[PDB]
Amino acid sequence: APMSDVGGVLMDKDAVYIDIERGEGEKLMTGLQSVEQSIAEKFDGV
Amino acid sequence: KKAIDSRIPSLIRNGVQTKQRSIFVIVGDRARNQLPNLHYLMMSADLKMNKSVLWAYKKKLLGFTSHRKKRENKIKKEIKRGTREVNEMDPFESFISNQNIRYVYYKESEKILGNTYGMCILQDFEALTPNLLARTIETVEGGGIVVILLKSMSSLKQLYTMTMDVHARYVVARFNERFILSLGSNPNCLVVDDELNVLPLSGAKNVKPLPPDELPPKQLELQELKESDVQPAGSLVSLSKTVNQAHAILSFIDAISEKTVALTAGRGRGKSAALGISIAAAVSHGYSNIFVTSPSPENLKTLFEFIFKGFDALGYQEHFNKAIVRVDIKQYIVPQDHQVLGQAELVVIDEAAAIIVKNLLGPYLVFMASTINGYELSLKLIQQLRNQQLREISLDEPIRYAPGDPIEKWLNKLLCLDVTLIKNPRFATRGTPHPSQCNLFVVNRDTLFSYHPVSENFLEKMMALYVSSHYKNSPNDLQLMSDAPAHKLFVLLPPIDPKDGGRIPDPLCVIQIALEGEISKESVRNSLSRGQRAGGDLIPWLISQQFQDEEFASLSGARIVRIATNPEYASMGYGSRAIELLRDYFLLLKLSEQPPHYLHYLGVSYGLTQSLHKFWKNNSFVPVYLRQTANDLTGEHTCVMLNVLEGRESNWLVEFAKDFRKRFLSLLSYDFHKFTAVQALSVIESSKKAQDLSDDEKHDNKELTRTHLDDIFSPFDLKRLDSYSNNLLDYHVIGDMIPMLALLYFGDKMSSVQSAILLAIGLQRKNIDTIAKELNLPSNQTIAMFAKIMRKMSQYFRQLLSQSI
RNA sequence: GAUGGUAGGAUAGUGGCCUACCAUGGUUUCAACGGGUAACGGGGAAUAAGGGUUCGAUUCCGGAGAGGGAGCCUGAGAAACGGCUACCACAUCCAAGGAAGGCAGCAGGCCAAAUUACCCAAUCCUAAUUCAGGGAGGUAGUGACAAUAAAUAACGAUACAGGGCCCAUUCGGGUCUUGUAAUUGGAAUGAGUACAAUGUAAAUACCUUAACGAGGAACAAUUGGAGGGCAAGUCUGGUGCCAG
RNA sequence: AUACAGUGAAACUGCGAAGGCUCAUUAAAUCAGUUAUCGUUUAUUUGAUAGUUCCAUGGUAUAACUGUGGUAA
């Protein structure tokens, strides 16, 4: 059954509508998600 | 209900649009219940898709049981309790109770080498061997998702190492850290919470690609051109893959159908279905080919070839371990071992498997030689192909389950399957100055395995060195050379003082099979209830059973390898070994100099290897004592395993010399049962054992000569009469076979022998007849060498008679 | 083993029930032995009913069976609806290593595929018990075969007309308070809507029953038959205006 | 209530289910009554019904339970 939510996965046009170390994961999803953009090299001056 | 992210569905969309695999790494506890959603997204991105799913785990499932009658009666008694209604299933229960899941342990990953899956669920992260990684991400196909679940210790390592360079704090493992950094580098991989949020540390930006295959259309065009008989039927049955594989099958068919002899050897990677092309060409060869064919695979390892043979036969016209017997209905084929079918090679066609080079030269002589060269040595086999046989050997490397994949690129980069044989030196004559210098530096393996770009390029050079034409090692051996406690390395590459650059002249991996350090590491690892890191000590601790070797620490060579240029490369390896003996005797940067002047308290230094001739010559330039071997035929090459161990320490010379003496005493008797190898190499081994005894002993293990009454009891008086009959008459077997055992024993005991007389003593020790051993070795003057052997026997009999009697 | 004798075996014991030995018996025209069914029928097998005279209450058709024969086990009672072993077929899971039970079953259907809900309150049965229970058993619901008794109106007043009805082939004859979408009046209650209480383990239903409930009493029964009549209408025929 | 003391998942226990469908056609041998068993079994019901003793309390071995595990189960 597309256009409906078989389980929880309701399919819109392009978006998907689903539903439902602790503080470490919550902080890495709150602030430190794309904070590791300029953290790749760590002075790797190759 | 909540919209998830603009990137995680779009990644699956463009992954199935470009037919590329993709990697999800999920953290958190409630992570099993989001594989329903990712499998639904993977199917609805493109219905025309494989449905099966792997659940590789190591010891125990997460929250379920994988037995549907068991969980069915469990949910039946849950109904009978009444905490849950009848027609109710949460999506994880529905996912495991409706989908097609194949369950494997992490140990038996070799059981699923052939089949194909749409999804792979790696359950545990902390133990992930790279051979298992290479076996699962290869079988995941182009619309595929490989998901990896995590643990709180890995979350601590993630929060640590996601800042710049820090690690986790207690054998420490860096392969999983190199894994985390590679997934941070990958564009087709990202890390997701248990709540379907995003950690953008691994491939942050991802756009939805635009809505829409020329090599596939060229494949269809050339396939239809070949279509417009039974040759086209075989071509369409084979070409389930790239036009490279189709062109290879067509060219092998053209060069091996009616031309009866060519030597065609198709070389390819782990993909592309080389065995599939062989088994799909088998039916065409049975049609337009001889009545007998000869396969040379491993025994009971011909799954894809036999499956494609039966599949193509059923396509065209058909109907102690396993069954590999020959069948026909309107043909013969046998998957045999090494060439015991020399007189049974009436088959005009033989197809061999990938690399035993001398056994390959023995088997491939008088028929059409098809050969499958899997990459998974090759240069030397191509040289032996060009050194003899209209060789039309050609094949290509386009993938089968993809056209090209960043997941395959990251897997090859992390598991280090990529190689490069470029020079990149200062000079070869200036590397000969390094061969005069014998200068070596340590590896600093923590900073080496920390994935940085130039460090990874030099580490790929080091891996190409450490597995360059080696003795068939593997990715689990790379993980042992990375993440073991008893390990070190040495890169004696450059002598020059130029700018940033260099090479790898010789890698050499040590293994501290110790007493103190190994006892410390083993008492540590007994809390983790595992551990096996003492091979060279434990072989002699049962064979020779010495408390001295129980108390002395030891370094053991895991591997050591140099370039494949010339004999100067063996000179470079000898200089590296001599520099290592000098090194034993006399974040972080990815080298060491002061630690190259540092070591441990080690007594013995040994290398364990197979009994090879050049390895024996290297062991003699090494001159490390040729200690106790084992003549059990290790079925890879059939080579006997010898562990030559020097003692380079304060006071161990009497122990090592007595061990060499016991090995020498055992070898002359053990050359009768299961050591019938050579004459010159046997003399070299006896000379190496006596050289070890002479170098180690001063006058301690100095044996007395053959005593009078004991020598009278060892022979007979009439046996010595027959010896005199050989001295003044013929040396026939009525007096030269009953006494020859004691003759060869006393000759190898203790007053000199020639080269022909030494081969005669070794020939009587090997107990072969006259026309075999001397005619194989010298191949000249058979009866004259037999008379010289009789004269040496007469001189020995005259010496023993004039000594005792 | 036919008939009996003697002894043993096995039995819960009697017993040719089985075996050794011995004798050649035994039933029968005073019906042996054998032949079949309205032996889905009969025999009392039993209750009988205040008029049904072989319809009209029930026990039992014969023995088996728990996939198929075989062997074993348990118990006051068994060759167990609930056990095991081996053989042969069905048959599901399986990671292909192995673990099983029986569902090769019972319900249904060939323009009525829904029975499978509530109780031991009654009668019995088991029960350590002044307690527990019994899919024994009872209660209720969907699932019409127009078979069954009632309703869809009753009673007045006023007005205004002169015609209504019957017979007969015909002419005609015979007779008499009869009509009308005319007005109008207050009484009646029943279907329905519903208080309850009774009933009952409980609930339904029957029984009893306050309140409301009629004018198109629209709170709106059918089915079939006989005959007309009409247009600036349409069609056909042809000796105007007609015939069909 | 410092050797037990009430709620009580899961385990031993006492008992529960204490009598249900289809298929091939047996003529007092299937059945009903009756005579008897000092010819015999019997839980339960009921009435009855036990006489040998030289120079202050008897033994480890298993659960449930903990702990280490295997197996797809």
mmCIF file with all atom_site columns, N, CA and C (backbone and C1' of nucleotides) in Angstrom, chain C residues 35 41 58-59 88 100 127 129 140-141 144 156 183 189 192 197 206 208-209 216 222 235 237 241:
data_model
loop_
_atom_site.group_PDB
_atom_site.id
_atom_site.type_symbol
_atom_site.label_atom_id
_atom_site.label_alt_id
_atom_site.label_comp_id
_atom_site.label_asym_id
_atom_site.label_entity_id
_atom_site.label_seq_id
_atom_site.pdbx_PDB_ins_code
_atom_site.Cartn_x
_atom_site.Cartn_y
_atom_site.Cartn_z
_atom_site.occupancy
_atom_site.B_iso_or_equiv
_atom_site.pdbx_formal_charge
_atom_site.auth_seq_id
_atom_site.auth_comp_id
_atom_site.auth_asym_id
_atom_site.auth_atom_id
_atom_site.pdbx_PDB_model_num
ATOM 1   P P     . G C 1 35  ? -25.392 -68.558 4.976   1.00 0.00 ? 35  G C P     1
ATOM 2   O "O5'" . G C 1 35  ? -26.732 -68.556 4.114   1.00 0.00 ? 35  G C "O5'" 1
ATOM 3   C "C5'" . G C 1 35  ? -26.690 -68.754 2.712   1.00 0.00 ? 35  G C "C5'" 1
ATOM 4   C "C4'" . G C 1 35  ? -27.951 -68.271 2.043   1.00 0.00 ? 35  G C "C4'" 1
ATOM 5   C "C3'" . G C 1 35  ? -28.413 -66.872 2.409   1.00 0.00 ? 35  G C "C3'" 1
ATOM 6   O "O3'" . G C 1 35  ? -27.687 -65.848 1.756   1.00 0.00 ? 35  G C "O3'" 1
ATOM 7   C "C1'" . G C 1 35  ? -30.258 -68.343 2.432   1.00 0.00 ? 35  G C "C1'" 1
ATOM 8   P P     . G C 1 41  ? -35.851 -47.636 7.445   1.00 0.00 ? 41  G C P     1
ATOM 9   O "O5'" . G C 1 41  ? -36.854 -48.129 8.582   1.00 0.00 ? 41  G C "O5'" 1
ATOM 10  C "C5'" . G C 1 41  ? -37.770 -49.188 8.345   1.00 0.00 ? 41  G C "C5'" 1
ATOM 11  C "C4'" . G C 1 41  ? -37.246 -50.504 8.865   1.00 0.00 ? 41  G C "C4'" 1
ATOM 12  C "C3'" . G C 1 41  ? -37.714 -50.900 10.260  1.00 0.00 ? 41  G C "C3'" 1
ATOM 13  O "O3'" . G C 1 41  ? -38.941 -51.613 10.222  1.00 0.00 ? 41  G C "O3'" 1
ATOM 14  C "C1'" . G C 1 41  ? -35.351 -51.083 10.122  1.00 0.00 ? 41  G C "C1'" 1
ATOM 15  P P     . U C 1 58  ? -37.543 -38.425 21.899  1.00 0.00 ? 58  U C P     1
ATOM 16  O "O5'" . U C 1 58  ? -36.927 -39.892 21.874  1.00 0.00 ? 58  U C "O5'" 1
ATOM 17  C "C5'" . U C 1 58  ? -35.551 -40.116 22.139  1.00 0.00 ? 58  U C "C5'" 1
ATOM 18  C "C4'" . U C 1 58  ? -35.374 -41.177 23.193  1.00 0.00 ? 58  U C "C4'" 1
ATOM 19  C "C3'" . U C 1 58  ? -34.267 -42.187 22.944  1.00 0.00 ? 58  U C "C3'" 1
ATOM 20  O "O3'" . U C 1 58  ? -32.984 -41.709 23.312  1.00 0.00 ? 58  U C "O3'" 1
ATOM 21  C "C1'" . U C 1 58  ? -36.252 -43.309 23.614  1.00 0.00 ? 58  U C "C1'" 1
ATOM 22  P P     . U C 1 59  ? -31.673 -42.279 22.576  1.00 0.00 ? 59  U C P     1
ATOM 23  O "O5'" . U C 1 59  ? -31.431 -43.691 23.269  1.00 0.00 ? 59  U C "O5'" 1
ATOM 24  C "C5'" . U C 1 59  ? -31.059 -43.784 24.635  1.00 0.00 ? 59  U C "C5'" 1
ATOM 25  C "C4'" . U C 1 59  ? -30.626 -45.184 24.988  1.00 0.00 ? 59  U C "C4'" 1
ATOM 26  C "C3'" . U C 1 59  ? -29.846 -45.920 23.913  1.00 0.00 ? 59  U C "C3'" 1
ATOM 27  O "O3'" . U C 1 59  ? -28.475 -45.561 23.885  1.00 0.00 ? 59  U C "O3'" 1
ATOM 28  C "C1'" . U C 1 59  ? -31.504 -47.350 24.822  1.00 0.00 ? 59  U C "C1'" 1
ATOM 29  P P     . C C 1 88  ? 11.172  -48.653 6.390   1.00 0.00 ? 88  C C P     1
ATOM 30  O "O5'" . C C 1 88  ? 9.724   -48.403 5.781   1.00 0.00 ? 88  C C "O5'" 1
ATOM 31  C "C5'" . C C 1 88  ? 9.145   -49.317 4.863   1.00 0.00 ? 88  C C "C5'" 1
ATOM 32  C "C4'" . C C 1 88  ? 7.777   -48.859 4.432   1.00 0.00 ? 88  C C "C4'" 1
ATOM 33  C "C3'" . C C 1 88  ? 7.694   -47.414 3.984   1.00 0.00 ? 88  C C "C3'" 1
ATOM 34  O "O3'" . C C 1 88  ? 8.118   -47.257 2.646   1.00 0.00 ? 88  C C "O3'" 1
ATOM 35  C "C1'" . C C 1 88  ? 5.868   -47.932 5.414   1.00 0.00 ? 88  C C "C1'" 1
ATOM 36  P P     . A C 1 100 ? 12.615  -35.067 19.186  1.00 0.00 ? 100 A C P     1
ATOM 37  O "O5'" . A C 1 100 ? 11.101  -34.654 18.907  1.00 0.00 ? 100 A C "O5'" 1
ATOM 38  C "C5'" . A C 1 100 ? 10.486  -34.901 17.642  1.00 0.00 ? 100 A C "C5'" 1
ATOM 39  C "C4'" . A C 1 100 ? 9.530   -33.790 17.279  1.00 0.00 ? 100 A C "C4'" 1
ATOM 40  C "C3'" . A C 1 100 ? 8.063   -34.180 17.289  1.00 0.00 ? 100 A C "C3'" 1
ATOM 41  O "O3'" . A C 1 100 ? 7.290   -33.123 17.844  1.00 0.00 ? 100 A C "O3'" 1
ATOM 42  C "C1'" . A C 1 100 ? 8.651   -33.332 15.152  1.00 0.00 ? 100 A C "C1'" 1
ATOM 43  P P     . A C 1 127 ? -15.389 -38.353 44.145  1.00 0.00 ? 127 A C P     1
ATOM 44  O "O5'" . A C 1 127 ? -15.001 -36.909 44.700  1.00 0.00 ? 127 A C "O5'" 1
ATOM 45  C "C5'" . A C 1 127 ? -13.682 -36.395 44.562  1.00 0.00 ? 127 A C "C5'" 1
ATOM 46  C "C4'" . A C 1 127 ? -13.615 -34.925 44.900  1.00 0.00 ? 127 A C "C4'" 1
ATOM 47  C "C3'" . A C 1 127 ? -13.970 -34.543 46.330  1.00 0.00 ? 127 A C "C3'" 1
ATOM 48  O "O3'" . A C 1 127 ? -12.917 -34.752 47.251  1.00 0.00 ? 127 A C "O3'" 1
ATOM 49  C "C1'" . A C 1 127 ? -15.139 -33.142 44.862  1.00 0.00 ? 127 A C "C1'" 1
ATOM 50  P P     . U C 1 129 ? -11.948 -31.436 54.349  1.00 0.00 ? 129 U C P     1
ATOM 51  O "O5'" . U C 1 129 ? -13.046 -30.547 53.615  1.00 0.00 ? 129 U C "O5'" 1
ATOM 52  C "C5'" . U C 1 129 ? -12.773 -29.212 53.214  1.00 0.00 ? 129 U C "C5'" 1
ATOM 53  C "C4'" . U C 1 129 ? -13.941 -28.630 52.468  1.00 0.00 ? 129 U C "C4'" 1
ATOM 54  C "C3'" . U C 1 129 ? -15.263 -28.658 53.217  1.00 0.00 ? 129 U C "C3'" 1
ATOM 55  O "O3'" . U C 1 129 ? -15.396 -27.537 54.070  1.00 0.00 ? 129 U C "O3'" 1
ATOM 56  C "C1'" . U C 1 129 ? -15.556 -29.313 50.926  1.00 0.00 ? 129 U C "C1'" 1
ATOM 57  P P     . A C 1 140 ? -34.467 -19.647 25.710  1.00 0.00 ? 140 A C P     1
ATOM 58  O "O5'" . A C 1 140 ? -33.619 -18.490 25.037  1.00 0.00 ? 140 A C "O5'" 1
ATOM 59  C "C5'" . A C 1 140 ? -33.724 -17.161 25.509  1.00 0.00 ? 140 A C "C5'" 1
ATOM 60  C "C4'" . A C 1 140 ? -32.627 -16.303 24.949  1.00 0.00 ? 140 A C "C4'" 1
ATOM 61  C "C3'" . A C 1 140 ? -32.518 -16.267 23.442  1.00 0.00 ? 140 A C "C3'" 1
ATOM 62  O "O3'" . A C 1 140 ? -33.486 -15.427 22.842  1.00 0.00 ? 140 A C "O3'" 1
ATOM 63  C "C1'" . A C 1 140 ? -30.374 -16.540 24.372  1.00 0.00 ? 140 A C "C1'" 1
ATOM 64  P P     . G C 1 141 ? -34.080 -15.796 21.399  1.00 0.00 ? 141 G C P     1
ATOM 65  O "O5'" . G C 1 141 ? -32.997 -15.220 20.388  1.00 0.00 ? 141 G C "O5'" 1
ATOM 66  C "C5'" . G C 1 141 ? -32.694 -13.835 20.382  1.00 0.00 ? 141 G C "C5'" 1
ATOM 67  C "C4'" . G C 1 141 ? -31.436 -13.540 19.606  1.00 0.00 ? 141 G C "C4'" 1
ATOM 68  C "C3'" . G C 1 141 ? -31.384 -14.065 18.183  1.00 0.00 ? 141 G C "C3'" 1
ATOM 69  O "O3'" . G C 1 141 ? -32.117 -13.284 17.259  1.00 0.00 ? 141 G C "O3'" 1
ATOM 70  C "C1'" . G C 1 141 ? -29.348 -14.544 19.261  1.00 0.00 ? 141 G C "C1'" 1
ATOM 71  P P     . A C 1 144 ? -34.447 -19.039 7.191   1.00 0.00 ? 144 A C P     1
ATOM 72  O "O5'" . A C 1 144 ? -35.617 -18.312 6.385   1.00 0.00 ? 144 A C "O5'" 1
ATOM 73  C "C5'" . A C 1 144 ? -35.959 -16.957 6.642   1.00 0.00 ? 144 A C "C5'" 1
ATOM 74  C "C4'" . A C 1 144 ? -37.277 -16.841 7.363   1.00 0.00 ? 144 A C "C4'" 1
ATOM 75  C "C3'" . A C 1 144 ? -38.150 -18.082 7.377   1.00 0.00 ? 144 A C "C3'" 1
ATOM 76  O "O3'" . A C 1 144 ? -37.750 -19.087 8.286   1.00 0.00 ? 144 A C "O3'" 1
ATOM 77  C "C1'" . A C 1 144 ? -39.478 -16.219 6.832   1.00 0.00 ? 144 A C "C1'" 1
ATOM 78  P P     . G C 1 156 ? -75.471 6.160   13.087  1.00 0.00 ? 156 G C P     1
ATOM 79  O "O5'" . G C 1 156 ? -75.944 7.605   13.533  1.00 0.00 ? 156 G C "O5'" 1
ATOM 80  C "C5'" . G C 1 156 ? -75.621 8.733   12.739  1.00 0.00 ? 156 G C "C5'" 1
ATOM 81  C "C4'" . G C 1 156 ? -75.492 9.977   13.573  1.00 0.00 ? 156 G C "C4'" 1
ATOM 82  C "C3'" . G C 1 156 ? -75.921 11.262  12.893  1.00 0.00 ? 156 G C "C3'" 1
ATOM 83  O "O3'" . G C 1 156 ? -77.316 11.465  12.918  1.00 0.00 ? 156 G C "O3'" 1
ATOM 84  C "C1'" . G C 1 156 ? -73.810 11.582  13.848  1.00 0.00 ? 156 G C "C1'" 1
ATOM 85  P P     . U C 1 183 ? -65.926 19.997  0.494   1.00 0.00 ? 183 U C P     1
ATOM 86  O "O5'" . U C 1 183 ? -66.508 21.212  1.332   1.00 0.00 ? 183 U C "O5'" 1
ATOM 87  C "C5'" . U C 1 183 ? -66.297 21.282  2.726   1.00 0.00 ? 183 U C "C5'" 1
ATOM 88  C "C4'" . U C 1 183 ? -67.503 21.832  3.428   1.00 0.00 ? 183 U C "C4'" 1
ATOM 89  C "C3'" . U C 1 183 ? -67.486 21.690  4.932   1.00 0.00 ? 183 U C "C3'" 1
ATOM 90  O "O3'" . U C 1 183 ? -66.679 22.651  5.577   1.00 0.00 ? 183 U C "O3'" 1
ATOM 91  C "C1'" . U C 1 183 ? -69.577 20.994  4.126   1.00 0.00 ? 183 U C "C1'" 1
ATOM 92  P P     . U C 1 189 ? -60.274 4.912   24.152  1.00 0.00 ? 189 U C P     1
ATOM 93  O "O5'" . U C 1 189 ? -59.029 4.000   23.821  1.00 0.00 ? 189 U C "O5'" 1
ATOM 94  C "C5'" . U C 1 189 ? -59.198 2.612   23.629  1.00 0.00 ? 189 U C "C5'" 1
ATOM 95  C "C4'" . U C 1 189 ? -58.894 2.262   22.209  1.00 0.00 ? 189 U C "C4'" 1
ATOM 96  C "C3'" . U C 1 189 ? -57.432 2.105   21.871  1.00 0.00 ? 189 U C "C3'" 1
ATOM 97  O "O3'" . U C 1 189 ? -56.970 0.801   22.157  1.00 0.00 ? 189 U C "O3'" 1
ATOM 98  C "C1'" . U C 1 189 ? -58.559 3.387   20.215  1.00 0.00 ? 189 U C "C1'" 1
ATOM 99  P P     . G C 1 192 ? -45.714 -2.114  16.409  1.00 0.00 ? 192 G C P     1
ATOM 100 O "O5'" . G C 1 192 ? -45.220 -0.745  15.769  1.00 0.00 ? 192 G C "O5'" 1
ATOM 101 C "C5'" . G C 1 192 ? -44.158 -0.021  16.359  1.00 0.00 ? 192 G C "C5'" 1
ATOM 102 C "C4'" . G C 1 192 ? -44.326 1.462   16.187  1.00 0.00 ? 192 G C "C4'" 1
ATOM 103 C "C3'" . G C 1 192 ? -43.538 2.311   17.164  1.00 0.00 ? 192 G C "C3'" 1
ATOM 104 O "O3'" . G C 1 192 ? -42.193 2.485   16.773  1.00 0.00 ? 192 G C "O3'" 1
ATOM 105 C "C1'" . G C 1 192 ? -45.760 3.098   17.047  1.00 0.00 ? 192 G C "C1'" 1
ATOM 106 P P     . A C 1 197 ? -38.163 -0.917  38.136  1.00 0.00 ? 197 A C P     1
ATOM 107 O "O5'" . A C 1 197 ? -38.831 -2.241  38.707  1.00 0.00 ? 197 A C "O5'" 1
ATOM 108 C "C5'" . A C 1 197 ? -39.709 -2.172  39.816  1.00 0.00 ? 197 A C "C5'" 1
ATOM 109 C "C4'" . A C 1 197 ? -40.947 -2.998  39.592  1.00 0.00 ? 197 A C "C4'" 1
ATOM 110 C "C3'" . A C 1 197 ? -40.727 -4.481  39.365  1.00 0.00 ? 197 A C "C3'" 1
ATOM 111 O "O3'" . A C 1 197 ? -40.517 -5.203  40.560  1.00 0.00 ? 197 A C "O3'" 1
ATOM 112 C "C1'" . A C 1 197 ? -42.259 -3.664  37.776  1.00 0.00 ? 197 A C "C1'" 1
ATOM 113 P P     . C C 1 206 ? -43.013 -9.624  24.314  1.00 0.00 ? 206 C C P     1
ATOM 114 O "O5'" . C C 1 206 ? -44.027 -10.637 24.999  1.00 0.00 ? 206 C C "O5'" 1
ATOM 115 C "C5'" . C C 1 206 ? -44.568 -11.716 24.256  1.00 0.00 ? 206 C C "C5'" 1
ATOM 116 C "C4'" . C C 1 206 ? -45.147 -12.774 25.157  1.00 0.00 ? 206 C C "C4'" 1
ATOM 117 C "C3'" . C C 1 206 ? -46.148 -12.299 26.190  1.00 0.00 ? 206 C C "C3'" 1
ATOM 118 O "O3'" . C C 1 206 ? -47.433 -12.035 25.665  1.00 0.00 ? 206 C C "O3'" 1
ATOM 119 C "C1'" . C C 1 206 ? -44.638 -13.784 27.207  1.00 0.00 ? 206 C C "C1'" 1
ATOM 120 P P     . U C 1 208 ? -51.704 -9.189  29.829  1.00 0.00 ? 208 U C P     1
ATOM 121 O "O5'" . U C 1 208 ? -51.364 -8.230  31.049  1.00 0.00 ? 208 U C "O5'" 1
ATOM 122 C "C5'" . U C 1 208 ? -51.910 -8.489  32.328  1.00 0.00 ? 208 U C "C5'" 1
ATOM 123 C "C4'" . U C 1 208 ? -51.333 -7.580  33.376  1.00 0.00 ? 208 U C "C4'" 1
ATOM 124 C "C3'" . U C 1 208 ? -51.359 -6.093  33.075  1.00 0.00 ? 208 U C "C3'" 1
ATOM 125 O "O3'" . U C 1 208 ? -52.621 -5.497  33.308  1.00 0.00 ? 208 U C "O3'" 1
ATOM 126 C "C1'" . U C 1 208 ? -49.251 -6.686  33.947  1.00 0.00 ? 208 U C "C1'" 1
ATOM 127 P P     . U C 1 209 ? -53.103 -4.250  32.419  1.00 0.00 ? 209 U C P     1
ATOM 128 O "O5'" . U C 1 209 ? -52.018 -3.111  32.666  1.00 0.00 ? 209 U C "O5'" 1
ATOM 129 C "C5'" . U C 1 209 ? -52.007 -2.322  33.847  1.00 0.00 ? 209 U C "C5'" 1
ATOM 130 C "C4'" . U C 1 209 ? -50.769 -1.462  33.905  1.00 0.00 ? 209 U C "C4'" 1
ATOM 131 C "C3'" . U C 1 209 ? -50.704 -0.347  32.878  1.00 0.00 ? 209 U C "C3'" 1
ATOM 132 O "O3'" . U C 1 209 ? -51.365 0.814   33.333  1.00 0.00 ? 209 U C "O3'" 1
ATOM 133 C "C1'" . U C 1 209 ? -48.650 -1.537  32.902  1.00 0.00 ? 209 U C "C1'" 1
ATOM 134 P P     . G C 1 216 ? -56.656 16.612  6.970   1.00 0.00 ? 216 G C P     1
ATOM 135 O "O5'" . G C 1 216 ? -56.499 15.423  5.926   1.00 0.00 ? 216 G C "O5'" 1
ATOM 136 C "C5'" . G C 1 216 ? -57.322 15.376  4.771   1.00 0.00 ? 216 G C "C5'" 1
ATOM 137 C "C4'" . G C 1 216 ? -57.083 14.150  3.922   1.00 0.00 ? 216 G C "C4'" 1
ATOM 138 C "C3'" . G C 1 216 ? -56.749 12.862  4.668   1.00 0.00 ? 216 G C "C3'" 1
ATOM 139 O "O3'" . G C 1 216 ? -57.375 11.769  4.009   1.00 0.00 ? 216 G C "O3'" 1
ATOM 140 C "C1'" . G C 1 216 ? -55.036 13.352  3.112   1.00 0.00 ? 216 G C "C1'" 1
ATOM 141 P P     . U C 1 222 ? -51.402 0.212   -2.511  1.00 0.00 ? 222 U C P     1
ATOM 142 O "O5'" . U C 1 222 ? -50.824 -0.880  -3.509  1.00 0.00 ? 222 U C "O5'" 1
ATOM 143 C "C5'" . U C 1 222 ? -49.582 -1.513  -3.243  1.00 0.00 ? 222 U C "C5'" 1
ATOM 144 C "C4'" . U C 1 222 ? -49.691 -3.014  -3.325  1.00 0.00 ? 222 U C "C4'" 1
ATOM 145 C "C3'" . U C 1 222 ? -50.007 -3.579  -4.690  1.00 0.00 ? 222 U C "C3'" 1
ATOM 146 O "O3'" . U C 1 222 ? -48.847 -3.730  -5.479  1.00 0.00 ? 222 U C "O3'" 1
ATOM 147 C "C1'" . U C 1 222 ? -51.439 -4.556  -3.093  1.00 0.00 ? 222 U C "C1'" 1
ATOM 148 P P     . C C 1 235 ? -47.144 11.976  -40.364 1.00 0.00 ? 235 C C P     1
ATOM 149 O "O5'" . C C 1 235 ? -47.548 10.446  -40.351 1.00 0.00 ? 235 C C "O5'" 1
ATOM 150 C "C5'" . C C 1 235 ? -46.545 9.455   -40.240 1.00 0.00 ? 235 C C "C5'" 1
ATOM 151 C "C4'" . C C 1 235 ? -47.138 8.078   -40.173 1.00 0.00 ? 235 C C "C4'" 1
ATOM 152 C "C3'" . C C 1 235 ? -47.918 7.635   -41.381 1.00 0.00 ? 235 C C "C3'" 1
ATOM 153 O "O3'" . C C 1 235 ? -47.099 7.208   -42.442 1.00 0.00 ? 235 C C "O3'" 1
ATOM 154 C "C1'" . C C 1 235 ? -49.098 7.070   -39.428 1.00 0.00 ? 235 C C "C1'" 1
ATOM 155 P P     . G C 1 237 ? -50.407 4.350   -47.836 1.00 0.00 ? 237 G C P     1
ATOM 156 O "O5'" . G C 1 237 ? -51.874 3.830   -48.130 1.00 0.00 ? 237 G C "O5'" 1
ATOM 157 C "C5'" . G C 1 237 ? -52.127 2.451   -48.318 1.00 0.00 ? 237 G C "C5'" 1
ATOM 158 C "C4'" . G C 1 237 ? -53.578 2.117   -48.103 1.00 0.00 ? 237 G C "C4'" 1
ATOM 159 C "C3'" . G C 1 237 ? -54.551 2.675   -49.117 1.00 0.00 ? 237 G C "C3'" 1
ATOM 160 O "O3'" . G C 1 237 ? -54.624 1.862   -50.269 1.00 0.00 ? 237 G C "O3'" 1
ATOM 161 C "C1'" . G C 1 237 ? -55.378 3.029   -46.942 1.00 0.00 ? 237 G C "C1'" 1
ATOM 162 P P     . C C 1 241 ? -62.877 12.235  -46.961 1.00 0.00 ? 241 C C P     1
ATOM 163 O "O5'" . C C 1 241 ? -63.242 13.535  -46.139 1.00 0.00 ? 241 C C "O5'" 1
ATOM 164 C "C5'" . C C 1 241 ? -62.916 13.639  -44.763 1.00 0.00 ? 241 C C "C5'" 1
ATOM 165 C "C4'" . C C 1 241 ? -64.036 14.256  -43.967 1.00 0.00 ? 241 C C "C4'" 1
ATOM 166 C "C3'" . C C 1 241 ? -65.266 13.379  -43.784 1.00 0.00 ? 241 C C "C3'" 1
ATOM 167 O "O3'" . C C 1 241 ? -65.818 13.593  -42.489 1.00 0.00 ? 241 C C "O3'" 1
ATOM 168 C "C1'" . C C 1 241 ? -65.896 15.392  -44.787 1.00 0.00 ? 241 C C "C1'" 1
#
